[PDB]
UniProtKB/Swiss-Prot annotation:
Positions contributing to Zn(2+) 1 binding: 50, 52, 110, 112
Stated name of the protein: Protease 2A
Reactions this protein catalyses: Selective cleavage of Tyr-|-Gly bond in the picornavirus polyprotein
UniProt-annotated catalytic positions: 15 (for protease 2a activity), 33 (for protease 2a activity), 104 (for protease 2a activity)
């Protein structure tokens, strides 16, 4: 679990969105595994606006933050689980690191701010949903 709180927005994995998120919806995209809802209070996270490929992510299944090198956002064919079908996920970055399904929502950050959130992984892979292109998160 986990979210980004920037301005009056809450950014979560689309597959973990609550009824309150859907009832206060700003934007959602299934191909990216992202959903954004509106908040009453202002958040403290800042979004990175950069092309960093090194940063640190939070892993809830280890209570630890790990430094990682990650790929540029791309369209990767994903994993067919017994929970979910196999499909193309867009704007996805991969790194070598531990993850479990419940780690989704953990933040990946660089020197500039928040880069994205945990969304895919396995066999020592963790994939993150990028948010650096969503410029509108910084206003309105
Ligand atoms: C519809 N839908 C779109 N996206 C999803 C979530 C897909 N994520 C996973 O299945 C998953 N996520 N992490 C970090 C893992 C680590 C090990 C094994 C599996 C996973 C569902
Ligand atoms: Zn950066």
């Amino acid at each position: 679990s986990g979210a980004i709180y920037v301005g009056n927005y809450r950014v979560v994995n689309r597959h973990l969105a609550t009824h309150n998120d859907w009832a206060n919806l700003v934007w959602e995209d299934s191909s990216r595994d992202l959903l954004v809802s509106s908040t009453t209070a202002q958040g403290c996270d800042t979004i990175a606006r950069c092309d960093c490929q090194t940063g640190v992510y939070y892993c809830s299944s280890r209570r630890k933050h790990y430094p990682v090198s990650f790929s540029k956002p791309s369209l990767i064919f994903v994993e067919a689980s017994e929970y979910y079908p196999a499909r193309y996920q867009s704007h996805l970055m991969l790194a070598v690191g531990h993850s479990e399904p419940g780690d989704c929502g953990g933040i990946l950050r660089c020197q500039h701010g928040v880069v994205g959130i945990v969304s895919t992984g396995g066999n020592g892979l963790v994939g993150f949903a990028d948010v650096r292109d969503l410029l509108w998160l910084d206003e309105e």
